[PDB]
Homo-oligomer: A and B are copies of this chain.
Amino acid sequence: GHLPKPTLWAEPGSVITQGSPVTLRCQGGQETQEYRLYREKKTALWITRIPQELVKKGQFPIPSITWEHAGRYRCYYGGRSESSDPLELVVTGAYIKPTLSAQPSPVVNSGGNVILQCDSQVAFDGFSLCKEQCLNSQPHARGSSRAIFSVGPVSPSRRWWYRCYAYDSNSPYEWSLPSDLLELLVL
């Protein structure tokens, strides 16, 4: 027949601060069941610890996330369906926090673009920029562990709040503590 690849998502989201709650949702449609979540590359042990009741409903809750929970996940149901697109679960708070700046400034004209700079006091091969949806960048040419991002066009009609993270690619799903919140003043 036609078993549509299910939809996988995290609530409240996929980038969650260590110690905090989150619930992985897999839902193909109807009231139920044969949902099967698994982490890519290394079996995730908490999944096996989810009450069949929640699994038929496609709810895989994590009361208190830990670095061990991080990873790329996919789920399916069942004949079976294709695996859902990957959901990368991220935990933050593992390394010192970088600093986020807007060059030249947070104040920018409507429809314009601004360069956001993420600087780390300790070297890293990976940086992330999220808007309270993240962007992933490698370091930038001239900087001692700094990634620079380009955001725009900005518009007043929208909220432009950012935070950036530094991480080691050896474990791409464990990010540093978030940077202070950076608010863009569109004009």
Q: Which residues of A contact B (CB under 8 A)?
A: 1-7, 9, 25, 27-32, 57, 59, 85-86, 113, 115, 125-127, 129, 133-138, 140, 142, 147-150, 152, 169
Contacts and interface: CB of A to CB of B under 8 A. Distances in A.
Nearest to A147: B29
A136 to B, nearest CB: 4
Contacts of A136: 4-7, 28-29
Contact of A138 (B4, B59, B86, B169): B4
B4 A150 contact: no
Contact of A30 (B59, B125, B150): B150
A122 B125 CA distance: 54
A77 to B, nearest CB: 10
A115 B4 contact: no
Given A29-B129, A129-B29, A133-B9, A3 B138 contact: yes
